[PDB]
Design a protein around this nucleic acid. Sequence first.
RNA 1: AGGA
Lengths: 134, 65, 56, 46, 56, 263, 33, 84
Amino acid sequence: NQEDSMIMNQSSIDRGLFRSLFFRSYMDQEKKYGMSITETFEKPQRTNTLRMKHGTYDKLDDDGLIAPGVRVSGEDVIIGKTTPISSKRDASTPLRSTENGIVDQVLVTTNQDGLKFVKVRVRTTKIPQIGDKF
Amino acid sequence: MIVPVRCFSCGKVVGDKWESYLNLLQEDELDEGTALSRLGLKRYCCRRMILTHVDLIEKFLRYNP
Amino acid sequence: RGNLMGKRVDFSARTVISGDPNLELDQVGVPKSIAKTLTYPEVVTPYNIDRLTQLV
Amino acid sequence: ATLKYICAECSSKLSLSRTDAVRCKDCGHRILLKARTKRLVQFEAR
Amino acid sequence: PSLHKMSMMAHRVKVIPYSTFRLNLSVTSPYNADFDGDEMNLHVPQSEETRAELSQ
Amino acid sequence: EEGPQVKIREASKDNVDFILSNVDLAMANSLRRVMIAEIPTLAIDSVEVETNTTVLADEFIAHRLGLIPLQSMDIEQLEYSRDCFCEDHCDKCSVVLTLQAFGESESTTNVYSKDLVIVSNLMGRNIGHPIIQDKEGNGVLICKLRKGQELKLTCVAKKGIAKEHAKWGPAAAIEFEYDPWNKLKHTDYWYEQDSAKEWPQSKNCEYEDPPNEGDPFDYKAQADTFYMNVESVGSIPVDQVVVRGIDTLQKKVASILLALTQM
Amino acid sequence: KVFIGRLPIMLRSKNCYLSEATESDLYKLKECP
Amino acid sequence: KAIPKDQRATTPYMTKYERARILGTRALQISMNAPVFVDLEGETDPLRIAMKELAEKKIPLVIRRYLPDGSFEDWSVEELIVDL
RNA sequence: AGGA
Ligand SMILES: [Mg+2]
Ligand SMILES: [Zn+2]
Ligand SMILES: [Zn+2]
Ligand SMILES: [Zn+2]
């Protein structure tokens, strides 16, 4: 506990001392292009583009969304999306590389424009550790 | 936000004692210092657990789904 | 000034620092994760050959 | 069985697929949620 | 900031658990570090030659 | 009667006040640690969540579940899962608990440690029963639900020790004192005018003879006679918190004696 | 008579719904009192 | 231009930098499977092998010391004193 | 927009 550091009761930490919740909301939308060339929220596979993320797409459902129960981890794909070009290109949203957690709430709404609007909250419990500030 | 089971410092169960505490104050009218003591909360670590709790759960319950 | 006198560099790491009364003056506590990321290029020599094969 | 999306306010289940219209049935609001996986999630009690 | 040649010194690795760089307290002063949330940089040499510069 | 002696001052379901004499401080302290840290208990360790429509998060609940005290009387006949031979768990190494709750009432629906149910076969041993000390008989208040707030989950309670997690802590605070008159000169009292007036006397001052000023310092003197108080959480009865502590430390030293023997 | 654009309203102001709103309404409206 | 051995006037002692660079160099060479001029009495680290080589002044290297004018004095690691 |  020398030079502005401190000793914490691990026993208390277990008991719930200073534990917190952490939520982060990843968001995306289906961008429309002039000639009705809209995007697609789907779970894509190889099928020409090959230009897609490495994270397990296998956590996604047919709507290109993870169900709100699943424990997500690496750059696991949280939102599946495709962009058409004059063909499946990938516009998927992976979990922030470093971060890990559980899918909390998935919001499937509409943009003012009348477009597919998606918001994915991902929750984790952050327990007091050795470099944590107080 | 919802009564802590077990006092962080010593680990004596504190989970059962919430409603009982809240009651020793409304119905029995007693002061906080005597209520805790009735409930057998001797050490201040245990006392602070209940005495400083903020049962936010109730406010959360006020929303629908 | 930004790309030549200074440079962003590989084989570099950074985290929160905390003191240890059980470390020697000249040592530095490195987190397992940080050691598992940073790498040293060791030339396969008859001295190290067997050690290195096991690390591999 | 199956309740693909749930309503945000009236909380009525919706079970819709692509090109159905992003709205509730008897309720207005275009909000809608996702209803948790049928696959159980296990957590340690520590 | 690195206003000293002592703001950059060579240390022995000690691989340890927990996510912090651990330092002996007596080495605190030259760096001007404290543990109120300070962060430090670590650079790994790649040559037998480079290490010799650090150690020697 | 033999070696180190006990003299119980006060006993209850939850507390044991006693005096330990003809012992080294090292031994009283070692036992103090053992009671806190190494006595095995049974606690909820894995929680599969089927549905949770609550204001609380899955893991927030999961955590509270571990802290719920469970009957660990016959914990000695339950195997540590790690030592058990099954793919994961079984009746030989675990207690399966079920918790299903729903807001039928317009008023708030409460979820208690009483609402737990044993689904595993117990083999007629006293284990896994949620400890209820509560006056109205409800135990720990786990959750609160309004209406369509459903809670469905399954628990796997496993044998463990406080070293792994303080949830397997069989004891709450353990009181410990020796030499209430500072006869041993083991402390140097901080004062402003008088250490006698400024520092309150303890209960145990009565149980020991005051030093009587006109006497030289007993350097010869060593520390024996320890006024302790073991508080049980309910998992194990207070007597056993002490007995098992003595036993665990014995078995611990035994391991060393045996380890030398294998060598 | 004539529509001349849209003015962003400040929450809890006269022109905001929430001003005349009661604790109970806000909880229904999903707003923290 | 190259100052003759009988006209050298720089320290007869080895500089901190010279030693560091010699050890670094031999260590590198040893590590690159160069021939080792001393019995490795169980030794495996190329720096510790280099220190052993410098200890017995069995290192076949020469420090070319440049003067501000551009001239220089060549000194063998065998001849330089190691009081460091 | 914050941290030493
Ligand atoms: Mg600082
Ligand atoms: Zn306490
Ligand atoms: Zn609706
Ligand atoms: Zn088993």
